[PDB]
Design an enzyme around this catalytic site. Sequence first.
Site, mmCIF file in Angstrom:
data_model
loop_
_atom_site.group_PDB
_atom_site.id
_atom_site.type_symbol
_atom_site.label_atom_id
_atom_site.label_comp_id
_atom_site.label_asym_id
_atom_site.label_seq_id
_atom_site.Cartn_x
_atom_site.Cartn_y
_atom_site.Cartn_z
ATOM 1 N N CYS A 122 35.778 45.684 39.572
ATOM 2 C CA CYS A 122 36.794 46.291 38.736
ATOM 3 C C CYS A 122 37.263 47.605 39.345
ATOM 4 O O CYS A 122 36.465 48.516 39.583
ATOM 5 C CB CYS A 122 36.228 46.490 37.333
ATOM 6 S SG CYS A 122 37.214 47.465 36.202
ATOM 7 N N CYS B 177 37.293 50.743 36.810
ATOM 8 C CA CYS B 177 35.887 50.968 36.459
ATOM 9 C C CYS B 177 35.187 51.868 37.474
ATOM 10 O O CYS B 177 34.375 52.716 37.100
ATOM 11 C CB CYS B 177 35.125 49.643 36.342
ATOM 12 S SG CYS B 177 35.800 48.478 35.141
#
Length: 106
Positions: free
Chosen positions: A33, A36
């Site tokens: 991600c 993230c």
Amino acid sequence: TMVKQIESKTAFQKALKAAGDKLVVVDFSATWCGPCKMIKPFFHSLSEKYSNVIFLEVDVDDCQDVASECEVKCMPTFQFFKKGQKVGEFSGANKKKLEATINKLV
Ligand SMILES: *SCCS(=O)(=O)O
Ligand SMILES: *SCCS(=O)(=O)O
């Protein structure tokens, strides 16, 4: 540095028990991600600035089963817990709101 990785469904239920009356912040993220990774160092640094707050981490790839039951659609998703119950949530790598939500719900 004060963040703990939740590697099982049991460790999740345990951490929420062991927290007592403290706020629990959970970061639902994944290793692939993009956003993230962008907000991760900030998350870790907040955990050594909030002794009153329990900072946790779930990996959705390992925990698809857990991620689904928590109705996680996208990542990062941050969910907040007092006692056993969820007291708030928001999604997206937003530095300002994450801090604001910790300050509000503590
Ligand atoms: S949250 C991790 C789920 S499993 O590794 O026990 O399958
Ligand atoms: S986010 C927690 C999901 S469940 O265990 O309460 O069903």
